[PDB]
Design a protein around this nucleic acid. Structure first.
Lengths: 197, 155, 60, 227, 35, 61, 129
RNA sequence: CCCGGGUAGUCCUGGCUGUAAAGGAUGCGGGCUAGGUGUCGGGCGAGCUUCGAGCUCGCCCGGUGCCGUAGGGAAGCCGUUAA
RNA sequence: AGUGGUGGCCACUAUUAUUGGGCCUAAAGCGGCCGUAGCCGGGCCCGUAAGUCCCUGGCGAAAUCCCACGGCUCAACCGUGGG
């Protein structure tokens, strides 16, 4: 069983990985292409993200932060925070955010969401120095050190970003009980995706 | 080969942990006896005998077959060539090294200035002498046996 | 004097207790959602997998 | 005792909790000191710990280890700065160490004390000497080491009444850690007092890094923190 | 004649090569007049 | 790294082309492989897997 | 050139532990090594273990339980009588009976505490705690 | 120091002399130890082919870097080519 | 009722390092290679008991040393008894 059609996934660039691998994500990697790009496992991705939806409902809405310093994820994160009432911070994560009480925007979550592990190093160090659980949107190039909930997919494309963020909102509000069915979301993919100006 | 070249290269070769010989070998101990005596009758030492036997005849290894004449020993090509009086007196490797030694010494005679081969000579001579010392510790050579370039020439 | 024996938290993916200022984590077991899986740095930095005691669910 | 609870109340109704940990200590969900340490939380508001361990505020329970006058060379003079290192602890297995920079004596003192409060740590205690073995927490339960810089210090259990067989910095740290008999040996120079103190800290932390069976707990009477 | 590398740092010093050579010239003349 | 070394060389039950001769041969021959009756070569040694020319019938381990 | 199986084995164990992996494959397996592996397993320092006939020298497969602070091989096989173990124990242990010592005795290699109970000296081979 | 010349030398033959920042300022052999990546060379498997192991990709082995987790060390730094 | 000055010896000293030291930048790895004695050496089966270990007789004399007790007022010292 799949939350979303497989062909939609393949169109979304979810399964398209880079020209690199790592020992950590050998399990998640499905296969290699003759050219060099790597392919992740679709089914494992689906299982992990439904698990993540089962998780995130257990927390409060506001308590959860979602951050994306990558440009392509900023509107997906703002849209997901709007949908689920989570706090969202796009752009340049101000250093010392959750570690520095004297700042104006001081806030201490109980879990973190990370778009690109490589780019969001500062967020992980801050959150760790507070000592919270970490969720990551990893790729076959990201690194599995210091992630409690890693989800494998292509964390560069806008389509994949919007699609997975949408599915995450779907599962969290499912497990929260506010919305029971999948068909109650009248917010299609294009609301989360980037707009090319 | 690290002991002089000091390079840890691994071009060794592997044998699976089989205890009994496999069934598909359609030859028996006496048949491999016939073939090995034929082969050494044709003028080959143990290495090439075993290579061709495992190559064309296909039998993976004669060490997987137990000698009828002793239950504790696994049959070997050297033992078989010892059975019929077709093992050599001087062990094969060392005879080879003597032959190469006289070869290099001749080339060196007609070429003095290549100190690189001087060092090579030094190396192969320490090799033969180590093997001979060991075999003396085992005693498969006459105790008065000792290297000489001239008898090597006779060899 | 009533002795104050606490239950010192034990990491799940190595069996080693959590030293007091280790910046470790505790989060709910993944597939069923009742077990409190702990995780220590020695299991986080290398990120070796953890198996839930209940559902046998394995993951980093 | 009652004075400590009075101090706790004064700070409770005076301090405004900011951090995520401030709630469960002001809202009372947390009351054990070891509650913070076990789970793997963080600490940033020193006001937290005196709620659960107000005894840290005792004048004797604070120790000033050393005061250094590190100079900064400028184009237009010599600008001094006091680097002061000081320790604060309770006599029941909780202690901390701090380094504070300042322009006067007082400011560095206060900042160092605050930092030391922030670096509070839990201390196992026992008796594993080859002679005493009396199961009480009158010594380190077993031999440990602590490394920082050149200096490496090893601490070894000893029988009771032996006293602190260690240099003065280690003497003060172990007096404020709740331990009273230990043999101690040092490799590397111990004149830089700061590294000696930090090394003793590392060793005390390393105590809890040792794997143990409940059999050992009942053999040395391993008191994890408060006796 | 096993020269100490420490002496080769020219701080507060003359170039080691020339001190070595000076010692050698002194050696020459002394062994000469001895015999 | 595999704990127990398993050989990357198999054995081959093969049929010669000319005289219809069955034989067991090796995957990585160190020397030439020739037929018993016709005598023609069967597998050529090289840096790796021998260069088969006849028809492989079965793969033995 | 490999010269001592036991020391490589115990070092390999400790080097696995400080990482904290689960399965270890001691390539140099010998009968004495197996006896040793039995010794501390009788104090559960390791989980199960198994012998694997590799055709060359055997390989021992061992699970860890994450309870080995350090496991070294006393190489120069010091012989010791019964009455002085406390000196050698203090040479290789952190605290009173905090771990074990493995002694080869006339009857068979095994731990030291019983060897005191049975009152037989021997030759130290390994220590671990 | 620059410029104009210029001897021994620098070349071949035979011998001596046994020296250097001959420095990776790192004596050598074995066992263990997260990773990322290139080239060199050998082997294997795919893709390309004007059919030359001639061209791209994955793996295994050895040599050669660079980055780098843990870990070390006063620090410089090193880090499976260990310090 | 002793203290001070000097001289020599152990600790301080892991600055002599088997326990227990360093040798890239602080003094310390020779330019490289070969190899004799010496030292250290893969696993399995049979034997031995040289080493190794347990028990047991003689012996390593006294005085000094540790301990309980008795005498000297106590002590030191001495005796008796055990190591």
């Amino acid at each position: 069983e799949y939350l979303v059609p497989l062909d939609q996934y393949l169109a979304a660039g979810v399964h398209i990985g880079t020209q690199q691998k790592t020992k950590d994500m050998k399990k998640f990697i499905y296969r290699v292409r003759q050219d060099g790009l790597y392919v992740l496992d679709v089914r494992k991705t689906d299982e992990r993200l439904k698990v993540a939806g089962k998780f995130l409902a257990k927390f409060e809405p506001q308590s959860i932060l979602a951050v994306s310093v990558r440009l392509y994820g900023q509107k997906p994160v703002k849209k997901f925070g709007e949908v689920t009432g989570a706090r969202a911070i796009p752009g340049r994560f101000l250093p010392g955010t959750m570690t520095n009480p004297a700042v104006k925007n001081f806030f201490e979550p109980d879990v973190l969401i990370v778009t690109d592990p490589r780019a969001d190093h500062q967020a992980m160090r801050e959150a760790v120095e507070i000592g919270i659980p970490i969720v990551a949107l990893v790729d076959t190039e990201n690194l599995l050190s210091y992630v409690d909930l890693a989800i494998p997919t292509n964390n560069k494309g806008r389509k994949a970003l919007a699609l997975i963020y949408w599915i995450l909102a779907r599962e969290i509000l499912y497990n929260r009980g506010e919305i029971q069915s999948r068909e109650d979301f009248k917010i299609p993919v294009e609301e989360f995706e980037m707009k090319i100006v | 080969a690290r002991m002089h070249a000091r390079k840890r290269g691994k071009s060794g070769s592997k044998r699976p942990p089989r205890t009994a010989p496999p069934i598909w070998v359609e030859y028996t101990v006496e048949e491999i006896e016939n073939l090995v005596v034929k082969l050494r009758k044709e003028g080959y030492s143990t290495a090439m005998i075993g290579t061709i036997l495992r190559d064309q005849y296909g039998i993976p290894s004669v060490k997987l077959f137990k000698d009828p004449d002793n239950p504790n020993r696994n049959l070997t090509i050297t033992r078989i060539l010892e059975k019929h009086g077709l093992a050599p007196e001087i062990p094969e490797d060392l005879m080879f090294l003597i032959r190469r030694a006289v070869n290099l010494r001749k080339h060196l005679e007609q070429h003095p200035k290549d100190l690189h081969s001087m060092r090579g000579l030094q190396l192969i001579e320490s090799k033969i002498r180590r093997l001979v010392k060991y075999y003396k510790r085992k005693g498969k050579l006459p105790k008065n046996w000792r290297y000489d370039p001239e008898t090597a020439k006779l060899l | 004097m009533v002795e104050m024996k606490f239950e010192i938290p034990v990491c799940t993916s190595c069996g080693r207790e959590i030293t007091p200022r280790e910046h470790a984590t505790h989060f709910i077991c993944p597939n069923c959602g009742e077990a409190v899986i702990w995780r220590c740095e020695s299991c986080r930095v290398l990120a070796k997998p953890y198996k839930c005691p209940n559902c046998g669910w394995e993951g980093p | 005792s009652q004075e400590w609870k009075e101090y706790a109340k004064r700070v409770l109704d005076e301090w405004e909790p900011k951090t995520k940990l401030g709630m469960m200590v002001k809202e009372g969900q947390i009351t054990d000191i070891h509650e913070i340490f076990r789970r793997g939380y963080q600490i940033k508001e020193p006001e937290i710990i005196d709620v659960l361990l107000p005894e840290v505020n005792a004048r004797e329970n604070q120790e000033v280890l050393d005061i250094a006058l590190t100079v900064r060379m400028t184009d237009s003079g010599r600008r001094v700065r006091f680097r002061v290192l000081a320790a604060v602890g309770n006599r029941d297995g909780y202690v901390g160490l701090g380094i504070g920079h300042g322009k006067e004596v007082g400011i560095a003192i206060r900042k160092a004390i605050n930092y030391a409060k922030l670096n509070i740590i839990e201390i196992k205690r026992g008796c594993g000497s080859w002679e005493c073995r009396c199961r009480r927490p009158h010594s380190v339960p077993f031999a440990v080491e602590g490394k920082e810089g050149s200096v490496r210090v090893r601490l070894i259990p000893g029988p009771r009444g032996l006293g602190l067989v260690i240099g003065d910095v280690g003497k003060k740290i172990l007096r404020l850690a709740g331990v009273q008999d230990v043999w101690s040996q040092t490799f590397g120079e111990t004149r830089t007092t700061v590294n000696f103190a930090k090394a003793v800290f590392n060793a005390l932390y390393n105590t809890n890094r040792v794997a143990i069976s409940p059999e050992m707990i009942e053999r040395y009477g391993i008191v994890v923190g408060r006796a | 004649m096993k020269r100490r590398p420490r002496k080769w740092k020219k701080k507060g010093r003359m170039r080691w090569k020339w001190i070595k050579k000076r010692i050698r010239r002194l050696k020459r003349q002394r062994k000469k007049e001895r015999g | 790294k595999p704990i127990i070394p398993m050989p990357r060389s198999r054995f081959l039950r093969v049929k010669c082309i000319d005289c219809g001769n069955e034989q067991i041969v090796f995957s990585h021959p160190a020397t030439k492989v020739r037929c018993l009756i016709c005598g023609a070569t069967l597998v050529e040694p090289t840096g790796g897997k021998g260069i088969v020319k006849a028809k492989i019938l079965e793969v033995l381990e | 050139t490999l010269l001592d199986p036991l020391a490589n084995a115990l070092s390999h164990i400790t080097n696995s532990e400080r990482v904290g992996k689960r399965e270890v494959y001691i390539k140099p397996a010998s009968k004495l090594i197996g006896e040793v592996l039995r010794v501390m397993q009788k104090y559960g320092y390791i989980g199960e273990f198994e012998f694997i006939d590799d055709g060359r020298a055997g390989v021992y497969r061992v699970q860890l339980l994450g309870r080995i602070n350090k496991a070294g091989a006393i190489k120069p096989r010091f012989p010791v009588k019964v009455s002085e173990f406390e000196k050698w124990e203090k040479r290789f242990l952190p605290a009173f009976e905090f771990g074990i010592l493995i002694v080869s005795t006339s009857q068979g290699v095994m731990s030291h505490k019983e060897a005191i109970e049975k009152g037989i000296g021997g030759r130290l081979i390994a220590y671990v705690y």
